[PDB]
């Protein structure tokens, strides 16, 4: 009811494994028509057959969120054969942190200001961010994770405010330590040493972001806006 | 019979639920499937509850609850255990005066709280909710009441969560803004402009748009989701 | 012939919860170093005393008294002294917090002292249109689940009541801030394990535990002149440690 | 004491730089103030000769590499280098906070040699003075993790990295404001009136002082009570 997007139009970048490719199935499982993005060729086509293997109309493509030229062309292609997407949920050493936060910024802003001008036409829009998981080793780790972090809530809560008016809204979901890839990869010690600072005790699914991310695109969520969303079983870090 | 992901069967305990945000979270209860049990503290009160919740199919009942007492909140979940079961999902709901305000609604909380947990620990699983003030009066007295409210809340949600969480009970918290609900409606029309124009989404929240953020924390999809403060509010953020 | 020191906090009066040792007792140095008249606290006679003799071994005018901030005659009457015998205290640091399903009590027991005390002072600092009240934050003292949960929970308490209380006694000039240390050095953790220490810094960018001196010193800025504007104010004083 | 310390204090020509100028030199440090124009610069010089505090004007474009080292380069071949920097020069929402952030690293990074090489350092970032309120907002959340992150970086060499967070201000900008957006302004402040540019000086100075040296990566706001989200 509240929670169809029957008749929405979905675009999820990096959805070829873990989070994004959750997220993905969870709107395609609301109903939503779902467009997954990967930075590579082989990548789009799996999210292609992950979509086809779960009964979810849409596609897979190739973009990469640094460059002008291919989001322009990307959101075309998604204009050209399947319509304006109206939800968009952006999942994609120790000098390093300043320039890694405003890259990623960059790359938010830049897809945002470009899926803005169908979502302002529609008078109604849903941007979802999804930050960086935990599980980087040592105090650059830590710093990079915290700067990552205050920016994108900063982000978040600003260009909320910018497009509300338009009954838009902006949010951001903050994962804590979620079984990933990525994080099975992590030395076993690290891993123990984690989840011993989370009170319930286990780790987080990605399908248990995705059904934050499913709620904030329907329309029971219309007046939250500007929120980060902590999903991380308990676990705080300043 | 024999559910699978919905909240039939789960039986959800909501107080302050005569009218406003309270009643509409518990229609929201109702409506995923829970046996409801809505509070008020006096027996008219009581009763208005179990017409309403009755006018909408749902199952439970309507009761007087006093969380200011510990007799009246042990006599109320005897009650509740007699006839429905434990109660899984607990919904609390409800410049010189704020910190008695605050001290209040974080007594009533604890003492709620502690005494829902027994059930919640022999079942493992738990929801424990906190609905936040609304945004009430213009003035300084009321923003600073308003802030005290929210951060008292804020931190005695992330507390409590951790306290529990290894039993796989959650505790989140809803901090509502500027809500369409009697209190606000009766603010006069000067108030009401220049507040809409420090909300982004130009518009009052209606108490529906809580109970639903209410419904989706309740739920098993939610269940990675705890110590957390959800802002419902339009985009206005004040402390 | 009467000696006028050329410090900030010349010819005020200030009052120093459990004084008798680590921060508190630094703190009321600090405030005697600046000036002041200070009058430092304890819950026994046997550390009233000790608090007089460690000011009168520093050349701090003032005094140390009994001080159950818990009872509200012990505080009327405790202030009634201060009043008869030095003069009102406009300066008031609240550092006497307690520890020990506990951290709600705690937290609760903690605040309950604050705006007993504060309330309390408050008379004679709207009488003055002028007042600094300075709330100190627990120490990190627990790395575990249970400590982590006791520190926060008092950390987000303290932040909002400073937050509140300063809104309610702002228009009287009087400022309301807090002090939030995270691991300073004591006795007690200089006898912690050599391998858990190096730990424990890790933790901390500036690799140091802080002296009691350094949360002294906060204090003694934001009782000044020069820290009028600053009110509702927790500042942290933890070597870059940020954990809640 | 800031006796025998150089410090350097962007955007000093007049308000809260002018005056965070004037404590640092009445602390006892050797000052240098920049301005983006000569005239500013040639003022800076005045302020501080009648002021009794040694030091200099400079003319400073934090936008520009080249600017930057070169202006450190005078200061290193005439004085000695800086250990305290206060960082107050800053300037859709978007853009702006970006050209801040990216201006403090700068200015920031290149300062960092000389503090490293001292073992000691005091980095001082003073945030925006009250789409404004979400410019305000963006502005501050970005300092606020950028300092606590720099300080981060730098912490294990003893410098520290902290920044100001000012309310309403009796400044240039604030003084032209008209009267109802005043007194709305007034109403939601405890203490009832504007702040001096003096008393965000004095909490620059106590930063800079030995007695905050186990602060860093705080924001400590300044203005009287009125809290924004
Ligand atoms: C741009 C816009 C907004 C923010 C930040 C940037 N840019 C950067 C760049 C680096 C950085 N490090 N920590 N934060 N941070 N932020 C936060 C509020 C909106
Ligand atoms: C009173 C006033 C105010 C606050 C808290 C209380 N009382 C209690 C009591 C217990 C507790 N646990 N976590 N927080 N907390 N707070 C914070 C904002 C002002």
Redesign the interface.
């Known amino acids: 009811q ?1 929670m169809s997007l029957q008749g929405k139009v979905a675009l999820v970048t990096g959805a070829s494994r873990g989070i994004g490719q959750a997220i993905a199935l969870e709107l395609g499982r609301l109903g939503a028509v779902v467009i997954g993005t990967a930075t590579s060729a082989s990548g789009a086509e799996k999210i292609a057959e992950t979509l086809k293997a779960n009964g979810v109309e849409g596609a897979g493509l190739v973009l990469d969120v640094s460059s002008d030229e291919s989001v322009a062309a990307t959101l075309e292609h998604i204009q050209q054969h399947l319509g304006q997407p109206l939800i968009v949920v952006n999942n994609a050493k ?2 390093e ?2 320039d890694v936060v ?1 890259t990623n ?1 960059n790359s938010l ?1 830049r897809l945002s200001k470009a899926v803005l001008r169908g979502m302002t036409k529609a008078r109604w829009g849903r941007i979802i961010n999804i930050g960086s998981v935990v599980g980087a080793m040592g ?1 650059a780790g ?2 990079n994770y ?2 990552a ?3 994108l ?3 978040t ?2 260009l ?6 338009r ?1 838009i809204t902006v949010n951001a979901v903050a994962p ?1 330590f979620i079984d990933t890839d990525m994080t099975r990869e992590l030395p076993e010690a690290q891993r123990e040493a984690l989840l011993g ?5 286990r780790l ?2 990605a ?3 995705a ?2 991310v ?2 904030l695109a ?1 329309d ?8 980060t ?6 676990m ?3």
């Open positions: 509240s120790d000098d942190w300043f405003n910024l802003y105090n830590q710093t915290a700067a972090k205050a920016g809530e900063g982000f809560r600003a909320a405010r910018e497009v509300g008016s009954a804590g600072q989370i009170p319930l005790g987080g699914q399908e248990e972001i059904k934050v499913g709620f329907s029971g969520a219309a007046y939250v806006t500007g929120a969303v902590p999903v991380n079983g308990g705080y870090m300043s």
